[PDB]
């Protein structure tokens, strides 16, 4: 176990545990520090850490050490020896707290028994040194008796306290003659700059800090935690391992930019969580390498050392011991050294993966910050962790006796307001950046802290262009960024129970040492811009603090003129009713309604966009912050379906794919084993390629990419929080102008309004959050995954034939096989890896990210051919290259036609990197159709002839469909050339078809077994495709009529996508709602309906029937429809150009007419033409019975006829049938009856007989109301125009 000391700092030094020492920094000169050994190996020195810097830069000044840290300064901490002595106390509590559970007290264990080697580098490998800085420190042992005697004392950590910036903790390393000890396998005395009391602040960004805005948020850190942050960069360079590699290096090329230090991949492996996933498969080899090829060097040392000169005292095989327990190497049974791969590799992997302030906090149950790249909060004080009622050595703050234990609500800063102070904003510095304009051109600070991170392509590691050589011997090298933590906790060979050698020893003489020398820079930088990004309109959303009377504005421009004036992103309607003024008796009353639309505004964030595929958007966004491409001007929604989560990053990123090194596989002539051994390595080296490439786009999009979205995502919060702000402050202003008597009767609650406000906040951010992280999901995969594939399956093809031609070289030595594998290389380099973000990293918040977005189907649309500027465009965002030529028509309703001439097609090449290629087959193909009916003089060839729509063909293999008469068929072709059928035929001897000539939904799905076709949803036909082969699918896809085709033959297609994945029933049921949905009403073909066009009537409860104007009566007889005539055999129908034409008008124009489109609720006259007349369809308003005969009459306004009709549609399911109300008036619920056919008998004096006629009736108006909708409800129309797909 581990054993914390006790002291005060008054307390006497007895030349042991309380000293005099000299710092390795004081180069041996200048004064001693009273030090107190608080465990074996670890000292306290409670003083200011003054090291390399200058005494007046502890005073706060218009400079910064750091440019990513809101610093604190107060050189008065630690400035009495009462304060010394508060520190000691702390320091001893926080280590007790620390040991109070296993890990800690193991983190403890390692750090006191990893005693530095004795010597560096320039040591020679037969001796041990101990005059060196890095092992040695003196103490003052002067007492009375030659005042000026000093010991020698080993020491492995000593903990000073803070320097300048007291919320700067550091962990520091010694550098001798250039090199450091504790980057090379040795070790060194390690020192570090600590203040328990002023900690760090943060937010959880997809959380919320108890979900107020008004109130104070974010945690507040746990002092122990970050002490063992700091404590575990000691344990790395205790042990030497601390090495340096290719680091992380902001992009700083642009003013947006977030300037900061290198990151090295040490520093983020401290952290933990998904960090360690910003360090490439590639670095992270590079890593393990150099720290093995350390300890090769010290493992060597311990055979060869001999004597130690500096002290003669030191006894050789006590230290042998010690430092074979610590590298963990193992000796035989003579003493001989050695490295053990399996136990240095555990020991790597405790270090690096085990021990990390994720997998701690995780364990002390503490919460942290999510990630190392993470806005910076500014410190709070804690009051006194000296008090238990505050702070526990085995809770910390989390106290379960004050309810405190459950979602750390002890660190939740608007929760525990009792255990920390704000700080005073007078003594905290900031790196800002002073975004100018070319005008005295007006100025904006942003902190460095908001700018965007954008990791340099100089970052990432280009080891995969380097050529590989093959053998025998050659395996996989994976290196997990992760370890288990509870083997850690339970291992038992772990923590060493070797004797920890004494810690006297002869004094140092050789006080050589670098001592870093530190300085501030400008706290502020002038940059000139004339760009309004992110910044600018966030800064636009802002007001002094010396104004309290504004007004909102949509006007960005204005509102960066005027000080009263308030930038807003909300609507036109919520602007005005912001800035309304009213009576008090009014007031009330307002308050509720600008409140509830605030809220209302702030909920347009859960807006959906199915008819685009997209399922959630924010439409404000680019209002809100105008970040990316300009997205604050035009539609947002628009711009976004076509460019997508691109338009909002700011920077688009070089990345850094490169061309896969070449494998040189190693000839073994005559050795048959060898030879195959060697095939099936590069066999496997190859896949570790594709993991290293994706690994290495990971890190990518998590440190260029996925922080760009985070920024968005904070901008959001930031400008929802300034609305509310100004809702509230014109919401005081409005009730502060009123007089007390007044206020007094004004029933208002301004606690309420707040919490309104916040929880309408709350509710956008959650859907902000979703909308961000797709689209940073959509971004990797369609935008970097790809890029990748490409390289890897060049990769591939160049391996491919490197190893069928090696197996051919060595044909003979292979004998009977070499055909057995030469086959064994084809079928592995077939199956291509697919990505999976849990590989790379196991962070929760990414995985779930990942998750979501591929259970979406919408993600597996693989190609959505859409309208867009006169032309069709991929909307995908796999970014297919389409050429429409000019032979095919296409307008705004995303209907293109596909005619008989040879220029009438499209072109489609498709994106070659997609897993499309799934090896067993899975995909889905869906579009819309509108086939024309066949020429009844030319049956015979519509029936015999077939010719291809859509074919997609590469190497004789694919899909196709395509058509013959009235049939519509799915054929594949796999490699081999073996073929498979599904098809469609839909009846053409029907008096009326719901086929011909009218759009319909298609959709065919493909899996391992069936091929299946679905019309308008239901599953029409299927086939067992078991035997067909490979089916290459991703080749060129050609839109066109090919056949033997006659010259009027044409087709209509809308919204063609494909899927690469089986649509399910369900899928397919929504995709059809969704597609066939619009505000407006459908004609019998299933086109707008049209005001001012003529139609024929068409009624779905009589098919066969038709309307005509009674040759002697103002009333519309019902006829039956006249048939096919001629004698075919194949065909049947009712002319559908029959009847009387009627004509849609518009009842008021003004009110919304600018468009000929018929929109469901419409007010419109039922109007026909007899003759040269255009006539009126009425109805008598005083019949008193269920229904009565329709009045047809000339265009006249009687006063005893309603004219007025109010076409409807009750079906919810998709229809092209409407209804025809009738309304006393349009402003009444008073609903006279719908539009039909009814049955009257007729007796007369020689005729009897029953007759239909054109009626209204009541009875239908509870009929429509029924469910499942009855649609062959006489009330039921549809519109038939002219169309050339229809000829009779």
Same mark, same amino acid.
């Given at each position: 176990p581990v054993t914390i000391n006790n002291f005060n700092y008054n307390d006497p030094i007895?030349?042991?545990?309380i000293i005099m020492m000299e710092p390795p920094f004081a180069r041996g000169t200048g004064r001693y520090y009273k030090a107190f050994?608080?465990?074996?190996?670890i000292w306290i020195i409670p003083?200011?850490?003054?090291?390399?810097?200058?005494?007046?830069?502890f005073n706060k000044s218009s400079?910064?050490?750091?440019?990513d840290v809101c610093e604190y300064y107060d050189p008065?901490?630690?400035?009495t020896n009462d304060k010394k002595n508060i520190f000691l106390q702390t320091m001893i509590k926080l280590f007790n707290r620390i040991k109070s559970k296993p890990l800690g007290e193991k983190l403890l264990e390692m750090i006191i028994n990893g005693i530095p080697y004795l010597?560096?580098?320039?040591?020679?490998?037969?001796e041990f040194n101990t005059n060196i800085a890095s092992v040695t420190v003196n103490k003052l042992i002067?007492?009375?008796?030659?005042?000026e005697r000093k010991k020698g004392i080993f020491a492995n950590l000593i903990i000073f306290g803070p320097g300048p910036?007291?919320?700067?903790n550091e962990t520091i390393d010694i550098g001798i003659q250039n090199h450091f000890a504790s980057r090379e396998g040795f070790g060194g005395i390690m020192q570090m700059k600590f203040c328990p009391e002023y900690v760090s602040v943060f937010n959880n960004v997809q959380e919320? %800090?108890?979900?107020?805005?008004?109130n104070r948020r974010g945690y507040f850190s746990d002092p122990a935690l970050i002490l063992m942050h700091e404590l575990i960069h000691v344990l790395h360079g205790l042990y030497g391992i601390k090495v340096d590699d290719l680091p992380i290096v902001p992009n700083?090329?642009?003013?947006?930019m977030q300037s900061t230090d290198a990151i090295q991949a040490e520093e983020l492996y401290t952290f933990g969580g998904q960090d360690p996933?910003?360090?490439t498969p590639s670095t992270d080899k590079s890593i393990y390498d150099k720290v093995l090829q350390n300890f090769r060097g010290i493992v060597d040392r311990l055979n060869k050392v001999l004597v130690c000169i500096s002290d003669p005292n030191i006894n050789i095989n006590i230290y042998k011991n010690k430092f074979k327990d610590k590298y963990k190497f193992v000796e035989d049974s003579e003493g001989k050294y050695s490295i053990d791969v399996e136990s240095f590799d555990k020991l790597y992997k405790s270090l690096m993966f085990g021990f990390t302030e994720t997998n701690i906090a995780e364990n002390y149950k503490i919460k942290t910050r999510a990630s190392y790249f993470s806005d910076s909060l500014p410190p709070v004080k804690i %009051?006194?962790?000296?008090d238990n009622e505050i702070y526990?050595?085995?809770?910390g703050f989390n106290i379960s006796d004050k309810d405190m234990e459950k979602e750390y609500r002890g660190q939740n800063k608007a929760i525990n307001k009792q255990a920390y102070e704000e700080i005073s904003k007078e003594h905290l510095a900031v790196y800002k950046i002073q975004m100018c304009k070319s005008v005295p051109g007006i100025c904006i600070d942003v902190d460095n802290e908001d700018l965007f991170f954008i990791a340099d392509?100089?970052?990432?590691?280009?080891?995969?262009?380097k050529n590989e050589r093959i053998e025998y011997n050659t395996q996989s090298n994976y290196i997990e960024n992760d370890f288990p933590i509870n083997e850690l906790i339970?291992?038992?060979?772990?923590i060493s129970k070797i004797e920890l050698p004494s810690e006297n020893t002869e004094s140092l003489t050789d006080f050589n040492v670098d001592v870093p020398v530190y300085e501030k820079q400008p706290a502020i930088k002038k940059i000139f811009t004339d760009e309004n990004t992110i910044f600018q309109y966030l800064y636009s959303q802002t007001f002094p603090l010396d104004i309290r009377d504004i007004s909102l504005t949509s006007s960005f421009d204005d509102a960066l003129l005027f000080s009263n004036k308030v930038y807003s992103f909300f609507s036109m309607d919520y602007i005005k009713t912001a800035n309304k003024v009213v009576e008090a008796g009014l007031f009330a009353g307002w308050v509720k309604q600008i409140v509830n639309d605030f809220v209302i505004e702030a909920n347009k964030?859960?807006?959906?966009d199915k008819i685009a595929?997209?399922?959630?958007?924010?439409?404000?966004i680019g209002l809100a912050l105008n970040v990316?491409?300009?997205?604050?001007?035009?539609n947002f929604e628009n711009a976004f379906e076509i460019?997508?989560?691109?338009?909002?990053?700011?920077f688009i990123p070089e990345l850094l794919i490169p061309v896969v090194g070449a494998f040189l596989l190693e000839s073994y002539i005559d050795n048959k084993n060898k030879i195959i051994k060697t095939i099936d390595n590069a066999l496997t080296k190859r896949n570790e390629k594709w993991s290293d490439m994706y690994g290495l786009i990971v890190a990518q999009w998590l440190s260029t990419v996925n922080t760009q979205f985070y920024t968005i995502k904070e901008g959001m919060y930031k400008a929802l929080n300034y609305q509310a702000q100004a809702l509230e402050e014109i919401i005081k202003y409005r009730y502060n102008i009123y007089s007390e008597k007044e206020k007094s009767n004004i029933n208002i609650d301004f606690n309420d309004i707040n919490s309104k406000l916040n929880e309408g906040i709350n509710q956008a951010i959650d859907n902000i959050n979703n909308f961000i992280n797709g689209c940073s999901v959509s971004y990797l995969m369609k935008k970097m995954i790809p890029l990748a594939v490409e390289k890897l399956l060049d990769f591939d093809n160049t391996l491919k034939k490197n190893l069928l031609n090696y197996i051919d070289e060595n044909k003979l030595y292979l004998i009977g096989s070499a055909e057995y594998e030469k086959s064994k290389v084809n079928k592995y380099l077939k199956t291509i890896m697919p990505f999976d973000l849990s590989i790379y990293t196991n962070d929760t918040i990414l995985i779930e990210m990942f998750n979501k977005y591929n259970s979406?189907?919408?993600?597996?649309?693989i190609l959505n051919l859409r309208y867009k500027d006169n032309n069709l465009i991929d909307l995908?965002?796999?970014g297919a290259k389409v050429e429409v030529y000019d032979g095919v028509e296409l307008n705004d309703k995303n209907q293109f036609k596909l005619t008989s001439?040879?220029?009438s097609k499209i072109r489609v090449t498709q994106?070659?990197? *997609?897993?499309?290629?799934?090896?067993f087959l899975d995909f889905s193909v869906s579009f819309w159709i509108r086939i024309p009916k066949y020429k009844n003089d030319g049956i015979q060839n519509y029936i015999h002839n077939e010719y291809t729509i859509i074919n997609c063909m590469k190497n004789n293999s694919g899909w196709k469909i395509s058509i013959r008469g009235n049939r519509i068929i799915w054929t594949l072709i796999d490699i081999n050339g073996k073929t498979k059928s599904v098809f469609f035929e839909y009846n053409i001897?029907?008096? *009326?078809?719901?086929? *011909?000539?009218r759009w319909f939904f298609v959709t065919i799905t493909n899996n391992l077994n069936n091929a299946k076709i679905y019309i308008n949803g239901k599953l029409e036909s299927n086939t067992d495709?078991?035997?067909?082969?490979?089916?290459?699918?991703?080749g060129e896809i050609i839109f066109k009529l090919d056949?033997?085709?006659?010259?009027?033959q044409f087709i209509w297609m809308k919204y063609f996508s494909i899927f690469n994945t089986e649509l399910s029933q369900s899928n397919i049921e929504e995709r059809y709602k969704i597609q066939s949905y619009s505000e407006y009403l459908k004609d019998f073909w299933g086109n707008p309906l049209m005001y001012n066009k003529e139609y024929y009537m068409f009624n779905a409860g009589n098919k066969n029937s038709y309307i005509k104007l009674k040759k002697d009566s103002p009333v519309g007889e019902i006829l039956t429809r006249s048939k096919?005539?001629?004698?075919?055999?194949?065909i049947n129908y009712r002319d559908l150009y029959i009847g009387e034409k009627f004509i849609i008008r518009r009842?008021?124009?003004?009110?919304?007419?600018?468009?000929?489109i018929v929109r469901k609720e419409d007010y419109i006259y039922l109007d026909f033409f007899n003759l040269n007349q255009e006539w009126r369809v009425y109805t008598? %308003?005083?019949?008193?019975?269920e229904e009565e005969k329709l009045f047809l009459a000339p265009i006249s306004d009687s006063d005893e006829f309603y004219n007025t009709i109010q076409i409807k549609e009750?079906?919810?399911?998709?229809?092209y049938s409407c209804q025809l109300l009738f309304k %006393?008036?349009?402003?009444?619920?008073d609903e006279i009856g719908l539009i039909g056919i009814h049955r009257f008998y007729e007796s007369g004096i020689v005729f009897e007989e029953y007759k239909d006629y054109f009626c209204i009736s009541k009875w239908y108006l509870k009929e429509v109301?029924?469910?499942?909708?009855?649609?062959?409800?006489?009330?039921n129309w549809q519109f038939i125009p002219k169309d050339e797909g229809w000829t009779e």
């Open positions: 007895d030349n042991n545990n050994k608080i465990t074996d190996r003083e200011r850490y003054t090291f390399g810097y200058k005494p007046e830069d400079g910064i050490f750091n440019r008065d901490y630690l400035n010597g560096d580098r320039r040591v020679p490998l037969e002067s007492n009375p008796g030659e005042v910036v007291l919320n700067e919320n %800090k108890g979900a107020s805005i008004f700083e090329k642009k003013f947006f996933s910003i360090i %009051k006194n962790l000296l526990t050595i085995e809770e392509k100089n970052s990432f590691s280009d080891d995969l262009s339970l291992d038992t060979d772990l964030s859960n807006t959906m595929d997209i399922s959630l958007i924010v439409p404000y990316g491409n300009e997205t604050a001007k035009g460019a997508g989560a691109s338009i909002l990053l700011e979406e189907i919408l993600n597996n649309i995908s965002g796999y001439s040879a220029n994106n070659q990197n *997609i897993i499309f290629n799934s090896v001897r029907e008096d *009326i078809s719901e086929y *011909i000539n495709i078991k035997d067909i082969r490979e089916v290459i699918a991703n056949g033997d085709i006659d010259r009027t096919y005539n001629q004698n075919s055999k194949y009842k008021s124009n003004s009110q919304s007419i600018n468009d000929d008598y %308003k005083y019949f008193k019975k009750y079906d919810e399911q998709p229809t %006393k008036d349009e402003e009444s619920t109301k029924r469910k499942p909708y009855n649609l062959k409800l006489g009330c």
